[PDB]
Amino acid sequence: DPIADMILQVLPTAANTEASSHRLGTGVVPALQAAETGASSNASDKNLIETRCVLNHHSTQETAIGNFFSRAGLVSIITMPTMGTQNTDGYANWDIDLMGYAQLRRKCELFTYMRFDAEFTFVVAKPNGELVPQLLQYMYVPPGAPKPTSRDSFAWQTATNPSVFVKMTDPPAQVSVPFMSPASAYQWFYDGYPTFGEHLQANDLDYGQCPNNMMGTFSIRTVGTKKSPHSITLRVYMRIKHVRAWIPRPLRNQPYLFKTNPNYKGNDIKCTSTSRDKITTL
């Protein structure tokens, strides 16, 4: 050797409260803590006041991440009417970006990285709520697959694409979409300019856009060559299962404006706490 320098605790129930008596002495001060160390206070209830033996049988299963995310939520509403300007040709291409509704978005913004599987549910209804015997076709378009330009296109042959033939008189179809992200987990917040070279003002749209969360398009159409006389409104519901979370973040107290970047209104900024008249009145 010529060179020398080159050589989890399972808590199914809550914690019980043990009995304690009065204390009189110096040197021990469980009340006085230091908040400048970045740590929470480790003081308990028995070290300050007199407590009794309390057997705590309260369960902590509702506070788990899996039970908090196993409830379905509305993520997208696709309107395919007969009259209008947007999707009157008989087909509708919806890009897969689950940021359009603020009920399930605030749950996903609680954590930074989240690896999970999802369960999609597609409910078909008319704009007035009625139902007609109409045949509907779903299709999943991953990035790299051709997008259809009509209802009789070659992309609706669906050789390798997943497709669900459902009817409006049928129950809603449930599928299980797996973890399709190329990274280890989904990244809800991307910090930095992902492009290369010198960044200009016209290329400022690419901020906060990660390619790992872009799953492509979701295309629907009416099965047939002729146009259907009935308007079709589709609602997508995602159920999160087998969820692992990392790096918790503060929630948002501001109303959402855009789904691309978390912008907020500058003139009207609503406070988190409810205001009152005086600090000494109640």
Epitope: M83, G84, T85, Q86, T88, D89, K226, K227, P229
Partner: antibody, heavy 121, light 108 residues
Framework: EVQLQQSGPELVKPGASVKMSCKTS????????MHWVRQSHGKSLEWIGG????????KYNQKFKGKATLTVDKSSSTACMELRSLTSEDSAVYYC??????????????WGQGTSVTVSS | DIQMTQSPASLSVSVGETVTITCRAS??????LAWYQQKQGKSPQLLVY???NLADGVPSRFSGSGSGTQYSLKINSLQSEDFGTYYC?????????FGSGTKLAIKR
Amino acid sequence: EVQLQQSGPELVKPGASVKMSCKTSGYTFTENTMHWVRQSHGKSLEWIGGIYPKNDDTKYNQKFKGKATLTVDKSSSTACMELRSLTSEDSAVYYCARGDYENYFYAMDYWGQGTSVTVSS
Amino acid sequence: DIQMTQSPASLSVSVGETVTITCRASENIYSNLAWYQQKQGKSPQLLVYAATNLADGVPSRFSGSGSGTQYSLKINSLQSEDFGTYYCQQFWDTPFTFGSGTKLAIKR
């Protein structure tokens, strides 16, 4: 109450391009769609395509997809079109008119003046 | 593409007789029909939309009726200013197609 004025008749050579205009007033331009209807010899009618002028929305024909583009300026109330790779059979009059509120159906009541465009060398 | 065929191509009749022109589409368009009147060197004007309701500036002499694929347009009574070609337009399938045209002349 609604008057649609087009550009003047221009004589162009085959191989070049042309650009017309359709200026109108009397109504809200951003809330009503527009269409373009050509009339070849003798009485045959075709449909170029529709345009919903909010930001950008165009419904192209399957035959005239690559030979016609529709642009809308939001400052002045006008509608301009552009054609590429003109030939002898593309010499016909062009019409412009206002459609329906937020709809491509409910066909046009008030039409344009019909500026004739001829292609000859 | 849903094509339309009008019959007849040209019909000449005098002033004071009923004129019945027909418009027929290859597929069902669900009563989405229009009617135009183009004079010599003039812009066309809408006569009756959706085959039951006439537009503004249109008199009560023009009355259209029809359902399904086959349609009709009845003119009673005919005047001297109603001469010109007539077209029909569908609102069902993109692109919209027009008829072949029906010229109305004066019988002598």
